[PDB]
């Protein structure tokens, strides 16, 4: 609702989009691009939407440690699938 | 499936609802003891230190007495004459306690005090309020009051008119019936409804209500209460009056036998339940107490409209957790309350018995037993100890349960004397247990997607650790909640916010 | 800027509350001349033919009465029984006025019948409620009632003892206690709340109160009413008693002079205002008045704990709609009503009056009445016809206004009688005027978008004509409407879907 | 809010994206990728992603014949751009 969410959501499904893209691009670039290595680019894209996405909701919720905590959490689950994709590639 | 999902031992039996500790605040019997304890230390249990174990002595140095701890009733009077606003509470030049906090809170409790009888407390049969007269000529107000009905009155006159008639509304099933039930209980004020059938074991098995006496203010008019309170600000002590006691038979008092039960919650706000010890939290219960009143009336003139017969309820005449429960609206949780998906505990519960055959509802499950069996939040934020901190629900023994516990379920335990000793030295009602509860949570779309993860096995641990590491709702401790300033900071936010907390 | 935004005329003066179609109902001269119409064919003025003109006869034929129109008392006697539930409505026999309906919208109706004195169409300074006393041993309900304050009590006598124990709260400027008053408001139950200074020209300028007579009814209980049940059910005509009349003396009946008022508004169901001439309507609009008497009165009693003079209102004491202007919440549509943004007509506005000096608000400008000028869409639903179809507003004069209409200030000009006359037809208020207005809308993302597009310049019109043709609430036509089988399929609907319409 | 609701605008969003990018490699294929021609592609689309929305919106409203009345009309006025800008190229 609001005039704002709908804009965010709009917004943070072009930048996963763009992050796919970007992955793709990269896989396809370096030569190695299989399909497992796309869905752990996947799921690390999926992981740091969602730490946006929860930071965005527990603004709107005015619980606000929330936000620095799951940043930290899904930003790191984010990550491993990113660190795993690099040193595979 | 099944009428109760919980295990009801056979040597279950009718709960006395004189026996309870707002009931047992006027049986004068309750003035000779001090009060008592499950556990008089629970430090070993918990590991930390036991601040409920002092309350009744201070409870009684507050009343001026030395000495000897604060009786039941002394105690139960204290938080009454607190709440009432004749006395000053301990934190009053704190933020959260001051004047206007006060007068915030009186202004929320006012329908529930003038015209629900202060149901919260309990009440008799009916509910019956006292009012001054007023003259319309001159409007002027009288001094001494009369006794009619309140909001949740059982007056049933006019069914049998409506019956004789031939306006009685057919249904053609009994689906339907409760469909239309629903709908109707929706757009009255309910925030959920559901249907349980007349389970006789949820009902008291002894109904009762309070002597008043009258006693002369200083405003020149005679106001009613259950204890003398110009003898008490006068240092001579408290006094009750007793009860008078009634027997549960429905055919005398209400007209008709129930065959099905309309329950029915009220949400309340959530960013007052966050400020839980101070009177903000007070006065989103007494606003839902008020709201849950007002509901119930138009519940039951809808269904005497209809020409069935009705029987509005609040806090007097059944259980209300098992009986939503068997309407399939919730889990009962640690801390004894029901836990409905989309609210957790913050709601209020008010029910309607009725004659009409309404199709029944199932009882719902949804992970809450399993997360209450590892969390043990509730516990650990008590500021008076009183919720068991076992890990597992058992069928409850009259070894492991006092006077004021119903045994014989498979539950946890609640010690009901610390959660009133803690509300006389508080000077409201406390919602701790209410407000860190980890399913206290706004409806949205990360809540919806973190409640899909606590049945999912590996996702259940994550996510019960990660509310408790995101800082939902505060700390968890209840001295830290007050000295480290989160209830002085979210008082000062809740004032300087202009709206709520809905998304 | 400014204290009033509209064109006040320098001719002004208050309004008599007693010339109102709802309290000059009970003036017993208004029972001896037919209703009068502003004009008695409206035809030419919107082209389509005049359905309202043959509801006088209608009504009279509906009363027994051959061969004159119905008078103003008869017809608005004919509506309250028909609300009250003593008859049948003309369509009871069809989707949307059955007994199902009736009954959802007597329960709905119980707090404001039975609470607030049946404050809808007006009350004295207090309001008083006839209620029956009760045995509280036997539980037995007496026969005769005492008449008791209601939920808008004037009752102000803490206020002074407040003051001499000091413990008055003191705000440290204007700002914060408009502040802490709004947010107050806000949790207390208010959808939307503002403050305006007290303008002493939407104050009327006599109060009254409705004169009761005794009369039995069949049950074997007494009841007041302010006109004579049994002789009109008998055929032997209606008959009224008058009224009490009081000056409009603050002082004497509250105890102070007010110097701002608290203004605030509750929003009623959108699925049911979509049934707009069905008895659903009628609930959601009962359910409204309920609300707005229960917040009234937790509001009065803050204001009063603060240490401060409270007098709470509903449809009484002043008029509300230039009041909640001046407080910022809306800008006068065409209707007459107050268009909030929110909400747009969907909503009921309650007042209450302080000495509490309050930083005012200031009146909102965002479209309204530019969309009005254009949009000539709630007149065209009218089953009566009684809204204006002139293009512009005008500064209203004695020739443009009957003895029902304040003049002198710059509006469109409403007919009360035939919006009195269609109630008395219909058996329940219409609400189709607010059905039917473009601003009837729920809050979400594209309503919000579309709210700016009636102030850029190009899109106003898009806007205006996509609301017409995309069909939200139904049929603008009042006839089509129905046959159409637009309301009865949103009847069936209503009762069929679960759950209401938030987004 | 809801569960639906986050996805569909996550959806939207990816789709207006998608859209956007087939515009500009259309253009860049047909050699004339000026920012007019892009901007006009984008008004388009922009209308498109509105019909779509507003026809949720109203679905979730009851409002059911705004569904495809919006449709209709903003559909047309995603059609104009896109017929001019076909013509352009
Ligand atoms: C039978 C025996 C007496 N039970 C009663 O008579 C309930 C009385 C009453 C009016 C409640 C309203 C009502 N009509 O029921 C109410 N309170 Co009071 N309360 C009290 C009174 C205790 C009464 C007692 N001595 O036992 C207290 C002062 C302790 C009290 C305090 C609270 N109260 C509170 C609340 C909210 C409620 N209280 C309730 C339970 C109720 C339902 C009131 C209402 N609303 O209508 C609230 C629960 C709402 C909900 N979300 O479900 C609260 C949180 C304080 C506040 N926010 O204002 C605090 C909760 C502390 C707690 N966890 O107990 C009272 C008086 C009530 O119960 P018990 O000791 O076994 O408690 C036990 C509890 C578990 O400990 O659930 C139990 N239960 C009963 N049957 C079954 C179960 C449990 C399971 C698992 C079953 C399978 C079956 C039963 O509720
Ligand atoms: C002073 C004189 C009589 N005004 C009154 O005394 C209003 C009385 C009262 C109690 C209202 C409650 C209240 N305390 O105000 C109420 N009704 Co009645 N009503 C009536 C009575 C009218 C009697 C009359 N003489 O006009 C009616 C039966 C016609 C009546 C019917 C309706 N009523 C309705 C409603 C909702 C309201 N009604 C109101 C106006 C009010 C405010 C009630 C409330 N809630 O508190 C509702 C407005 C809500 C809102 N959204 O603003 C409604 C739609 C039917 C329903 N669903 O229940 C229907 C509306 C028809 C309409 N558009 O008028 C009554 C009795 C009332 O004004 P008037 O005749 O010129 O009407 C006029 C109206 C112009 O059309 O705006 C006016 N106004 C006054 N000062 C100024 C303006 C306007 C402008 C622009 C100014 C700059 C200044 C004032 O509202
Ligand atoms: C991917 C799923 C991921 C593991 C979700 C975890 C999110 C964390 C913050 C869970 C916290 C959490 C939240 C946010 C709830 O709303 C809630 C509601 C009811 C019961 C439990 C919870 C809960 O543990
Ligand atoms: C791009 C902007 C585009 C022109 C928006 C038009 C949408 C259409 C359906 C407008 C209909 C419309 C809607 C949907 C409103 O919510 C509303 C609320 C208050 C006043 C007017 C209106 C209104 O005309
Ligand atoms: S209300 Fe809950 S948290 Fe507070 S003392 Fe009682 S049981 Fe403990
Ligand atoms: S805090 Fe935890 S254990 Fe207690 S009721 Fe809530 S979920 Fe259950
Ligand atoms: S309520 Fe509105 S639409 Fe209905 S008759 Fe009265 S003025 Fe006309
Ligand atoms: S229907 Fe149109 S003219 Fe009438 S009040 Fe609404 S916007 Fe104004």
Redesign the interface.
Known sequence: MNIYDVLIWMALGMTALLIQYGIWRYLKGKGKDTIPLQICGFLANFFFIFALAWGYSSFSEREYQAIGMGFIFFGGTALIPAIITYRLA | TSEFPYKVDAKYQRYNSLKNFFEKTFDPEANKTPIKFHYDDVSKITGKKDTGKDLPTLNAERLGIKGRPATHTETSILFHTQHL?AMLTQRHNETGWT??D???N???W??EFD?SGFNATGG???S?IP???????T?E?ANEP????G?YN??N??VE?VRQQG?Q?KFESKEEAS??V???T????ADLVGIAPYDERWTYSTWG?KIYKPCKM??G?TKYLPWDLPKMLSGGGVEVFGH?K?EPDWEK?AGFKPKSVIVFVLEE?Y??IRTSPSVISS??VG?SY??MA?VA???????R??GYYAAPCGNDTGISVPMAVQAGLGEAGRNGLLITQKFGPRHRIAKVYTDLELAPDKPRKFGVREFCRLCKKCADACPAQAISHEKDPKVLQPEDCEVAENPYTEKWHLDSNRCGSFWAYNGSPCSNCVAVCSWNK?????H??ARIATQIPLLQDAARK?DE????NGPVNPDERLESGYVQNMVK?????????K?
């Open positions: 606003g004047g206007l006060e007068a915030l009186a202004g929320a006012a329908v015209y008799g049969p009916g019956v009012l001054y007269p007023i003259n319309p000529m409007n107000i009369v006794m009619v009905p909001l059982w007056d006159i006019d008119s306006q509304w469909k239309i629903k709908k109707a929706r757009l009255l004020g209500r200083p405003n008019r008078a009634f008092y706000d960013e007052a006065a989103t606003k008020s709201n007002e009336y138009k519940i039951a003139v809808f269904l409209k209809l706004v409806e949205t779309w990360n919806d997607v990660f590491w995101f800082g939902y936010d809740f004032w300087n916010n202009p709206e709520s907390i998304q």
